[PDB]
Subunit: 509 residues, 4 copies
């Protein structure tokens, strides 16, 4: 139904069609109230408009070489390159570049755009046989996501459990099968951290009644979102675009997704009462082996933005001349370079998987995940220790600049160091502040550092990849070879010299 | 005079008297508008009430042992202990404890309360001879600050300069003498980072026309503040106390202070067209040698709060059971302990200064300044890597809890791990979020890491203190002694063995 | 018997008496050979001489005000201040200063000097009633250690266990009671990390047969040490004092202590088949609450040395003029200052304990333990990144300086930046290298970072101290007070303003 | 000529031929004595044997697919792949893999093997026109290095200068032209950090008399090395292979190289009295744009080794079971992965340069240089906090294991946690200790952190590369676009909503 808002079946949504497709009476709450229409609501309307611009870019003739491919479905249509299964390392590189072009439309700040779950679509299309009796659902969902550009999110993090409650009552907390019918399955439960789900068409949701994976439409009866605070709405109500230039347009609301007696049609079921497939899906389904290409590129585009924003901030404060400041900026550049290089390795070392599909280099994926929190924390610390005074006393509002009684003083006392007027100085530094210190900036720090999992778990996943791939045993073979070349009596290889002719310990002792 | 709002001259303001003293038509702007009355304005009214609670505490009988001393002026009155010159190490310890008690009333979140510039009053009273012809102004301001509890701030950071402008035009940016008159001096210019000046009575403001230090009242004609965004107002307009429990009451607005043709009477001048005294004041005036006792204790109280708030957050999420989580919490405890220990050393190693006054240990002050940014950054990182999942999806509003259509789901899906209901879980985690992630939390991170100087400069000040005190030369004497005990021919001291009897190099190489 | 080498019972050993007391046929191995005499052996003779200098300092008239007190035993003698129980905060401060004076005789590099276990002596004398039937042994050992200056070490770390061995055979690994006799107990087993035990008189060694604490003489039959590599001997055999100025005189050999059928007289037993007392000893015995005063001061003296050595190294390389270098040096100063300040707090906040004894502030002890590894790692990193080129190419040997064919080039090409000749430049930088990069320097990095326990365990001990003392509940009371002042309907205290008059959410939504 | 020790001109040295070529009476000092023969001297003989094994690998049939290519000279011979100019991204990838295979023969511990300066040979062969009148010398040296596998090092770091000396006297410290003759130039001066030059055939050495670049043979009269302490000799004299398994065979002595009246024939001169070419050579000559491929791969191979050695050490101590230990190991794996990934990017993003040659990605080179010191420091810290107790008390010597009076106790008390006997436990942990804590280990820490420049300078080089490439301006164009989309009156683009309909500030403040 959502794709029926398109005027053509041979291309994805335009932005205008996407926005119309959201006017479906989805059940969303924020600040204790029901949201009538996400495309007009003060908490969501600009974020929706920002996503709609991504869809518009797909149809600009000058963008289509970098953004789009023909579909592989026989439709005669086209789609964003990352919505179609890659069949070579170069395909992955072209997808890398198409993701980057989309990411640049939000300067790297929207991390859960439609291309993130395009990797889920492609995993379905590349390995549909994984799903057994639901193999045809996988194939059909791949085709649908690819041709239409359907916006998916995933809701996968389980709600907290009160350990002191009876084991009776806590089975109601997790997503669980309630009833099996001929029309599909009825499910109830919740998932937390449903980031930007208010703007999606579908969410993937992932005792055998708990071992499910299925697709849920956002407008299905019983599907509800409970929103977190809206940095977009607060910036609109008490600020301005000048004062909160990122909060006002790129806020991705991290919701709780609730399912209350929701009917999931059988066509939307992918794994059903199946602990074994649920267990193997992360390794074998492909999604976890593919989405970090998007996530790494998106972060790299954000680091492009932050790197130059730091340079511009240091230009206007005048400290960029100093050697130590330039060295700090150079380290930020190195971190920015790192994530582009990891995405290079992802594509260049890609491997054949199944049915001709290629997967990016797996070690590079795990490495991006471990390094990103450290890099982001270090960059934020570099920014704050270099743009010291300049951020703390910024005037409250564009209203200060627009009142000549106040502006007369700002014009004298808050100019930029490099011939820059006060309006441009304050503008640049307010952009940096919205990037790192606003509530939006603080949420993004949380997102970049912890969202991918706990620091232990991401390091364990890195170790497990090295072991499962055989890389660790290959490294161990080198250590074992080294140990084999000597023993407690001396060398065991002929090319090295016995030290008996020079050993002085007998003489000494 | 602001202190004439008191019903008695033998004690500082009560909270109600302090609030009345602020209703003086000071000129403050925020969001393009003039503020009518800071005690009722949506951007300032709770922060003002929060400071007023500090004044109220001074008059509670159960608080006076820890908070108050008699004045040393002969007035028969009393004051907060840090407003009177300390004359022993134990005096400093009592002041340390009185600062701590006041700091606990904002849980460590208000950093520019009146006790901060009480150290400026005491510096004036302890070394008034520093000021030459203005020595009597120093004595009189000490007496006035001490007896009244007048709220001072300092505005000292200079505004930025456009280097491409002519040298004419940019000299108007700094505070400068414009006119010398019989009634005082007329001055214009600006200072940035006038933290909480909207709630103060006076600010200290510090080619000889630029070499000035003087006191300016907040209600003087031509003194103006241009405010930054108000986290208090935003939290009031789009949130609630439950949702922003710190933003809503402890926001200290970091303003730009503008002076436009302000007449400063001669009794308010402390340094006048005097580069030499301006240069020597940081070392010799005493203020810089005394206020870090207040700042270190205030930070330590905040770390008390953050330490236990982290523990409570880990209780809520259930991860406190884990060894690695308990170790992370234990490191936060160690950082918290560090700043209390530094303040112990400040008092125990205090030194006689001038006129019977004592100064806290100088090395401890420099050390606190270097360590605080690293500790705060490390603690914030520990918090985020331990409690993040719990913070990211918190419902928007107390309004969600108060709508049963939503609360029915929150009650089921967001309970605490330890038998705790969802209201208390969400409450604790929203408090942690306001501490570290809200715009208020982000400002406080900037404040703790950056306010005190650049990272280079605070380290240079630490090195210079070690050198100026003679500590570095004493350390160097130990290295020189070590070097003196051998040379290229062997040991030069008799108690160690020549290695000639065991050296094998000739055998190996000849 | 060892103290009978003294010519007087009213003072501790002189250095010469101490050295004679070591010539007792203790059983020590190194490099596969038995050590005849530690005071003349190439691996130990200079370290022994270094310790002997500590004993000599006790008898210099100009040193006795800072180093010595009258004994509290009625002997009419004197002793090092830290060997006598402190009865006030000022006593602890005087002990702090007496420890520092001894530490300066090794420039902070000997960490297991006799004053470390003087705290064990004082714990015995302050709380002898802890030991029940062995209370009189505690009293008698306090008197003996205090009057004589007996050199104790502790051997407490258990050897590793092969988990695949039968539970039979692994009971022989740990120290265990073998036989109870009227002459004492026979024990066998081992302890690792018996640091400098080769130069001690006694070691404290700490199914009920495993729950023991007792004192073992180094010359008891069946007591044996297996030494690690001797940096002293290697520096003597292949270097010189000029080339290894710290290795050659301050090496504290980290031995394995073996007990093979050792008879421990009953007078040497302190805890016997007593799991309860073994468990409570760390909290209640006092030793763990007292020795970190010595350890913190010793580290602070070492940081005094390293701080000025870094400054001197940067003077001779010429980089001290640079702002960033001076800032790095200033951070080293701050770390150095930190440990002196912690020792100040230890003394100033000291508390009455039992029998009039005072204990240093407990939180300060735990804090020193957590901070020291981080500070030492950071300082070493600051040194290496600032004294870059200057360390890597230092000529091999004082023999190079003493051969004019080589010295003619060193004199031209390796001068100091500040008018300093090549001999002094090379000398300073070789001292820095021996401090951080030699095998001795690497061992000291290991010692400062990990010896006090694992990074987790030292942080857990810090948390437990805060909880056990009630500090954590006091901090929690402040958080609870904050939470009590509002609820989901608004403030619960009268002094703050209700936001109902300014709340805009109804209008917005 | 050293290559005349080969039995064939159509391949590089064998190991035995390389060792014979070193028996040339080069002038090397160590411990105050002249070295007679580096291939037999106790300070150099195993390091020489270790390098010789690299040459032997080139001629093993099972190794030649990964190690060797035909020469491009028309000689009909073969060479190590990194000794021939790369003409595509795939060429660089094959070279990357050939470097890795050689690096594995020292487990990543020898960092100045012959393939390091093979990039200098290739730079000469790819851009010989850079050298003007010496272009033909560049071409000829490329041919010679490529066909023979000649072992070059570079000596480029200048000796320290005493600033208190007269300006006369300190100009004799640097390498300088002394005499211009028909047979070549006579030069004197010194360079420090001539790593492993004792085992090389030639060194590149790089007021116009100071602006030189030339090649000097190690056996030229007047060329001398003054060695640092030999970890190989000390390990041989006072240890054993079991006790110091890396020190005993992989020590690369960091010498001072002295030139005293050395005649450099004109065929060995590349830049002569030419400040402009000296200044431009780092950017334009190609060597600096090519050798970091070798250095990054060599480091990655060492991290392969250290990663698994850590795992094996944690197996020995039994702590690998613990979650926090496995996480620490996983971070070491991530750092190891990083440098392999950087080398992937170096090859995949390679660019056409000049004369058909390709250069590796420049940003990746700069990134490797900035990241390597932080990674190595972090890894060493992870190792020490996980395996320290196991390292501190290891028995002194294989002699302890071989004396049954001692071994009886070691067999009981120092077993491995996982059914491993004491000999193997002690062996693994002594290998880890030689890697990180021995004097060799400490030198390698200095080498990985500091050799490449100061921490400031390597970051500045990274920034300059981003600016010079145009990358920074492209990033800045994105920031400028963002700024262009709004102003102080609202949005300037049509797709976003004006907030005038929801802005509440007038209501709040009017």
């Amino acid at each position: 139904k959502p794709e029926d808002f398109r005027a053509s079946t041979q291309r994805p949504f335009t932005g205008e069609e996407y926005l119309k497709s959201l006017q479906d009476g989805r059940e969303i709450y924020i600040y204790g109230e029901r949201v009538k229409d996400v495309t007009t609501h003060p908490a969501f309307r600009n974020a929706a408009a920002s996503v709609a611009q991504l869809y518009d870019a797909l149809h600009k003739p000058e963008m289509q070489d970098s953004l789009c491919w023909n579909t592989d479905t026989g439709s005669g249509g086209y789609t964003h390159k990352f919505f179609r299964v890659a069949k070579s390392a170069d395909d992955l590189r072209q997808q890398r570049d198409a993701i980057a072009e989309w990411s640049r439309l939000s300067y790297g700040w929207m991390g859960r755009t439609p291309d993130y779950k395009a990797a889920f679509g492609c995993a379905l299309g590349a390995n549909p046989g994984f799903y057994g009796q639901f193999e045809q659902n996988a194939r059909n969902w791949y085709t649908r996501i690819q041709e239409t550009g359907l916006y998916f999110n995933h809701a996968i993090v389980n709600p907290p459990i009160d350990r002191h409650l009876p084991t009776d009552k806590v089975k109601d907390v997790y997503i669980k099968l309630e009833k099996e019918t001929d029309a599909g399955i009825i499910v109830s439960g919740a998932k937390v951290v449903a980031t930007n789900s208010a703007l999606t068409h579908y969410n993937m949701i992932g005792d055998p009644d708990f071992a499910l994976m299925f697709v849920a439409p956002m407008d299905a009866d019983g599907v509800k979102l409970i929103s977190r605070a809206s940095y977009e709405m607060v910036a609109g109500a008490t600020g301005s675009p000048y004062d909160y230039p990122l909060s006002s347009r790129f806020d991705e609301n991290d919701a709780i997704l609730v399912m209350d007696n929701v009917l999931i049609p059988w066509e939307n079921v992918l794994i059903y009462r199946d602990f074994d497939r649920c267990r193997r899906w992360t390794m074998e389904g492909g999604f976890a082996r593919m989405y970090p290409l998007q996530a790494c590129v998106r972060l790299a585009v954000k680091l492009d933005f932050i790197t130059a924003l730091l340079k511009k901030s240091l230009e206007c404060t005048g400290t960029l001349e100093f050697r130590g400041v330039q060295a700090d900026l150079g380290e930020v550049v190195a971190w920015r370079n790192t994530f582009w290089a990891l995405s290079d390795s992802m594509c260049s070392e890609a491997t054949p998987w199944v049915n001709g599909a290629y997967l990016p280099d797996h070690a590079a994926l795990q490495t991006y995940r471990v390094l990103a929190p450290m890099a982001y924390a270090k960059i934020k610390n570099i920014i704050e220790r270099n743009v010291t005074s300049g951020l703390i006393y910024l005037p409250s509002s564009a209203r200060d600049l627009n009142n000549p009684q106040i502006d007369q003083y700002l014009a004298k006392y808050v100019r930029g160091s490099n011939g820059m007027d006060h309006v441009q100085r304050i503008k640049i530094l307010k952009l940096m502040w919205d990037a790192i210190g606003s509530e939006f900036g603080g949420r993004h720090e949380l997102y970049e550092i912890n969202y991918s999992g706990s620091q232990d778990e991401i390091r364990l996943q890195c170790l497990r990849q090295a072991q499962n791939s055989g890389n660790m045993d290959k490294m161990m073979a080198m250590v074992d070879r080294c140990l084999s070349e000597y023993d407690q009596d001396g060398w065991t290889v002929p090319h090295l010299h016995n030290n008996d002719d020079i050993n002085m310990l007998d003489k000494l002792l």
